[model samples]
Target: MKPEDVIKEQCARAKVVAELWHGFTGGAPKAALENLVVEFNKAQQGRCVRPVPQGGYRDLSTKIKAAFAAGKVPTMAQAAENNIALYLEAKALLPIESLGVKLQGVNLTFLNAVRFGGVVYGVPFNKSIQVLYYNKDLLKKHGVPVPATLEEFVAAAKKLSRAEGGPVYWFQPDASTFAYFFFNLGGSYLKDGKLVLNSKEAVEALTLLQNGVKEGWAKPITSGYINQNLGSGPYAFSVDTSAGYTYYLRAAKFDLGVATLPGRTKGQPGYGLVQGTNLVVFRQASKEEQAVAKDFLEFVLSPRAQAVFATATGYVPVTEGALKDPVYQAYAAENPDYATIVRQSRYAKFEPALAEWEQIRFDILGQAIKEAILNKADPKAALDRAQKLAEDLLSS
Candidate 1:
């Protein structure tokens, strides 16, 4: 079907004004939407051109709530899963399933992180997982193959470091990174709706990371700083987001290898945290606008647009069908590294979908973990304190 034809059928009954939030720093989704707009305008004979106002998700949420309260909300708007609890608490979001027959073939893995109380509330347009990126040339020179287990990873680091003339291997172990480790190691931060990070597995995972730093195998980088120096062939490897493939590839100027995060134990796969945002519709949107939003969303899901998005941004395509698209298939053929991430995605874990998750992520988990990595506290003690803080926050 022609792209324009698709837009015309989907948006025939609705006039949509879409408010886009600014915090989606990656911009792949927005760029995909813009490409759809071009096709939409061409197909609909200029009948649909929605205004997309961009601002921080919180700022946009406040404005949307105020508008809803004043009975002046837009036809459609964007929100984050982190802020989803706000709208749910205020009764300001309409479930997407309520607006139409099920969008056939939409990926549910994307929804698991956004759904609440058995209702699928949002249409997820972006998803990502974490992976380890290593300087391949450095590894080759040091005669170390890619590490598969935590034990091998540390050994590889020591070998690479000593070969470089000092203790130089570094692992970027942020709070979220450690959380993924905990989960992969069979540690649960929450169990039966209660905090549980003090478990044995959790402490062991923390110590594994702490010992890396203490033994000079890992070093923490300041937030927002590129470990480009490592990429330059001195440091052996670093664990970073798979979504950063484009950025790292462009800046590294050398051959790099990608691998799944190392497993903590035999028989268990390493679980990396999924780390991207989703597209949510607000409750205050009109029926026509909701229709338009879904239409626009489908346009993005179409093979052509998804191919462009995945190729341009280094993110995995959201649709299974996208893998068959010529552009995507060709990109995969040319870049074996991208396939490494796609393969590792089988083990990705979504973030917990509690309303207070936002505060828990930034204020508590991230803060405590950062402190621990900086040696302000022991990793075990830091996580223990964080567990208590999370329990108190969730309880209140």
Candidate 2:
């Protein structure tokens, strides 16, 4: 490991030219965040912090890994919690708490994912939960209530499709997207630091997914941020990021609603997959630069800043105070969709944050979803295939 004391001493006397790499990697979110960086920089009156864009999250991951070999890591980066294990493995990260930064009233459950070795390594930036986004008008026209179980969902889907109205499009479910159902069916991706993707619960979950497609209740829509278009599209409902709640409100011509994913029985307890990026400091940085990074994080987490970010960028606020703040309150009052993410926060669960999870979750598990949903692969066979792929990936 790098010597902290040596780095600290040099940083105390060094310049505070802090560098940060942010996410969403898209033009819209990127511009909103870059505006905030400029806001923070100007607010500092020259304390000097800058955002260094690094394309998308995947690209940022590849770049960060490559930078270590070249000894040119950034001061801090906004990254997903799942990457924590991988970055920590390289000994390239330091706990943001190590710099004495504090976040009072922040939800620990949301903060828990980025912890390791009794250390809090990162802070939640834009914590988001996945919810079932539905078109209210279509459901009303079909005389279907928002479903709370598989039977209700299947029945409602049939009526909506046969009503001679909008198309009943595919429900895109990736590994992260499917994690909600996988868990609601009592499946766990990793138990005791080991991959267990082929459990009976897993097969049952995939069976429900496969049957949904075979019965024409739902189909697969993969590889796009198509939620923004779901407002006017044929999909009865879709599981999408809560950060996108507001996007639906502005784009949808019909009434929209958000709810938790269905469980085995109506009103049964269920959970949704929470997705978002965390702000992390790098060990390659000097203590002064780290201090600057922490200050920037503090600013971003403030209720006022969080409200602005949520309102403008479509991300859920990370702090409770943000929900109560006048800025967010007024926004939520004007746009109730803004409050739906907050309403569903209680049912949210963090994605797995262990080593090699990226490949296991996105690559292997995603392919498994595609095979079952698209190619009609046997659910048990699909689970077994993914389970073996996970064994090879996790064993490495």
Candidate 3:
């Protein structure tokens, strides 16, 4: 059956509305889904539901779960690792398994990460892999090849730094970025379900980042705002998710290059943290509404729709079958550099799903890294205090 027909039948039986909240700020997925909505309405003989665009996705789960508790939640909402913890804690989200056979093979890694006590809480919508974006002309002008290690990255940045007071190209690692770096370095914030960011490797990694800033190889920009500055061309390179690829291409006038982020040490595998949003069903919905939500979720996951979405938006496909879809294959062939993002997925990792991690991200780690990079405090001192604060936060 055609994908739109599948959605029509399911939505008709369920007799409910399917609401989609656009998570990414760039609005590419929103535009892509607009086409899907048009097709869905054409097949169903009317509109199936309303699709809403939100300001951001990072904190959406909390807002959505609160709406569910109030009996006014949308049938579906997009979530990410940072907010998945809230949904699981509130017990306001439904497991994908509850949707049963229709959603089989819909990227279980996302579901598995949000599962608490074996109950899955979300379905994957976007699988974003982080990659390095470079200004090819700048690098060539500076006589530096693409950097392959942390030291090499610093060296290249220093060489490319303009003497006339332009900002350096390298992004100073923030707390979230540093967490991804630790994973790339084979370190973790947790061990045996306990806090472990105070380890030697973690300290060393943060030290390298701190030293980069102190040594003038990098500078700090807040999380999720790097694209705004990088696109303006003050910096020659920045690390961002695959989702930002299309945005950078459209927004920047410079010659751009995409590559894997440098590793912590030579021979260590480079890893990128997957940072995309997911569509989740809430438990407070009626049976009919739940069915409608499930149907729309399945339609979005189908190979044809996913291929179209990924091709147009620079989002990585969640389902393995999506890779074989003609639209996706053609897009990948046309943008061979972006295809490297999928190849780099061999080293992909997810943020820890612990409920306390949310507080740790905002209250401690993020703040501490900002202070250190801004030179309000020394890196070692700032991180030492932040680590202690994280331990207390997680312990509570």
Candidate 4:
């Protein structure tokens, strides 16, 4: 969508409203996100953008698939990079740049959310990376310094949890978190489109996590946001997403600290999953409507809007211009805790966004972790089982 649609239609009275079906899911993981669209609408600009919440990512995906079948696609959607193929297969996407709006100095590398086939399909609407949130008071009392390396991180967890019924350092890992471990150890879950979960490095990574739990260095986060529990509970530290940056700031009553994720070794750079939702324009609307939609996106990606989005929510700005915006610059300096996210984002990696990868990702990686943590399954055995289970998907 671009500005010219509005240029010609300025003669018309009715406003052009673009429906953006999104998966923020019941409207509040990042609720302020819709508010950003609401603000854009309230601006009474050329186009009024309506960001509609259509359940979560799963729900959004299912609904979009149905919409594709029924010829009832929304004007746009908040989609992940993997979903790009599905939408493109359904002919639901419009070449983002063809709409006459361009992200002029924005680097496309950080926009894995919608970057595919060497083309951009959407704005990097809201990007996030993972970081560790710690209870500094608890660490100080225990005489444990903030851990920079994975070794010290596990050790500090051990020290903090040594007290009888003392605070347990709760850390949760899914496919996303575990991928970093696989990377740090120089092993991969995929090799030449085949599952490599049975590899030596995978065994070591799983064992690392298993020992962390078996030695009482860490435990599972069973309920609620880890930050919520950290603010009022016995847990001393948490490794969570930067999206929770603002929430942790508001929720933690005690002395809270944030840091880049623990590295393989001290002073070495760490890794994280740079994950977020992308805004993709569908082809259901007319050229003019799509143009206005693109125009609205241009407005959304403007430095001012990007700055507001980052500060309002914990998501890092997608554009370099926003990084230079005085508002975001001052906010970054004033709140260094949140700044850890932006700093960490520089070194993070995006998962391979293949459509088939999603199922294998959660099923294989998640199942392996569950077996290792819950059944005390040998790391190698658990991974081997997971690898066997995923062969069909991996080989295909």
- TM-score (all chains, Cα) for each model: 0.85, 0.89, 0.86, 0.89
What is the lDDT of every predicted structure here? 0.67, 0.73, 0.69, 0.73
**Tens-digit lDDT string for candidate 3 (1-396):** 544345445456643566665554446766676667655545543337556656566455456655766767776777776566776766667777767625556666655765677766677777788888888877777678988786687777777765414556556456557765677656877778777656766766677677766666666665545656664435677777888777777766778888877887767547888877777776767786676666666777889988888777767777878887888888788888747777766567877776666667776877776776666576667778888888777666
Candidate 1 at residue 192, lDDT?
A: 85
Indicate the worst ten consecutive residues by lDDT in candidate 1.
17-26
lDDT of 1 by residue, 1-396 (tens): 434345444446444444434343334444555555667555543245453444654566567667768976555555557667666897877777776625556566776666788887776665677788888888888789888887788789888776786555555556567776677677766678775656788777777777677777767766553544544336677767776776677777658778878887656558888766666666666665666666666666787777777677656677777788998889889988768878777777766666777677777777766776676577678878878998898778
Q: TM-score for candidate 4, please give it.
A: 0.89
| Candidate 4 local lDDT, 85-117, one digit each (tens) | 667766678888888777777755665457667
List candidate 2 stretches off by more than 4 Å.
1-16, 165-169, 228-233, 264-269
Error of 2 at 107 (Å): 0.8
Per residue, candidate 2 scores C-alpha lDDT tens digits across 1-396 of: 122233333334445668787556554466566656666765653455666667777788878878888889889887787787788888778877767778777787767777787788888887777777888877887678888875676677777876744436356757865776787777777678777888888888778778777766665766566554453447677777776765666776777787766666866536777787888899888877877888888888888888888777667788888888898989889877667666667777776786677777778888888888888888789879998988887666
Q: Between candidates 2 and 3, which one is better according to lDDT?
A: 2
Q: List the residue pairs that clash in candidate 2.
A: 167-234
Clashes of 1: 1
